[PDB]
Design a protein around this ligand. Sequence first.
Ligand code: GNP
Ligand code: MG
Ligand code: NH4
Length: 403
Amino acid sequence: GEFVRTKPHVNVGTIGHVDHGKTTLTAALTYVAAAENPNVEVKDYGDIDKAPEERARGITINTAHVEYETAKRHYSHVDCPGHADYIKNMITGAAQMDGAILVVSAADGPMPQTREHILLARQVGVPYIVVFMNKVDMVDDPELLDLVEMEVRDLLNQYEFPGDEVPVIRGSALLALEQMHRNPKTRRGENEWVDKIWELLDAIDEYIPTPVRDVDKPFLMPVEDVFTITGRGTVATGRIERGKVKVGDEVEIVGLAPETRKTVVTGVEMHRKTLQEGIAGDNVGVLLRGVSREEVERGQVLAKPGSITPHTKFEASVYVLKKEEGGRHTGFFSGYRPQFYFRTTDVTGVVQLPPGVEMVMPGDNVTFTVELIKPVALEEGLRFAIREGGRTVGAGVVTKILE
Ligand SMILES: Nc1nc2c(ncn2[C@@H]2O[C@H](COP(=O)(O)OP(=O)(O)NP(=O)(O)O)[C@@H](O)[C@H]2O)c(=O)[nH]1
Ligand SMILES: [Mg+2]
Ligand SMILES: [N+]
């Protein structure tokens, strides 16, 4: 049908180590919210981990976007993979979040991708974190629980989140989900596990603010995914960063190709509901005329024509991770060619150290020059992550555009 705005819109999502319960929690949130609001459609576990490859490998691979609502706000929720080999997909998900739910298993405590996701969430601009300590149904010992919370709070402090202040809600995504399957009309106050999901929803409502967005600036939407809808055409999805888009608007597809391409927007939807106008903050699908899914891709941005010129060369200030943060064991030299992650963009780049700087070591705060192999929408002050060989090695911020 159509999309009617009634309340503020906020983008959230789930991050955390593999198997800690992100997808089960995402499902539980839809069920719990649906009992109290008839406009929420429930999403079961298999509705989220829906792809054949996810069923095959037994993990989340692709991000999933689900919708739910509280009395206060409307949410789009991006559920990210925790597996170490799908960090690239997690980064693109986090690039869409106004706040993240960090899921940590009470039975395991923080693990390497608990650290890595916190670190990366920061580098794609996630401003607030709420913690859900999951699987408490498995942990009687209340000292182990206090310890996990302590460790998580301290870990957040390491990446400049306010660790001693974040809400930490203790619950079981699975038992709440079970209760909602047995009674889909279960209301707040009836069930112990469901009420913990309400505690989480309250914390999301109140701790994660609605961000200041600018709908007056030129339209800009980083592309998070692209697909073909049968009988309609190519859809590029993403969170609108600023400005507005209406059907009939000409937009430019910027980045990753040798040259920029223009086309006309022929549809805008949020959660498969028709939008008269997409605005900053909306999580939308934009139907694009006359382009195939091989002509638009993740990491490009849609923009008002002429408003963004992509770049290839820049200066940056970089912190190189110590190995005690899952970084490199050894340093690197000029000519090092890692992957650079800017918002939803992932691109190989060449490190060109200045004359006199022979080597960069883990733990170093350093400045250098990067030449990307493809043009990308870039901006001064833009944060990025650096990865190489399947591990995060650095965190940086663009100092100055050179080209
Ligand atoms: N005992 C218990 N098990 C739970 C709970 N929540 C999830 N699990 C179990 O933990 C396993 C992983 O759950 P899942 O939601 O897929 O985790 P994930 O964090 O989304 N995995 P991935 O990192 O691959 O996306 C499943 O076997 C699930 O049943 C819980 O509250 N209690
Ligand atoms: Mg999952
Ligand atoms: N998924």
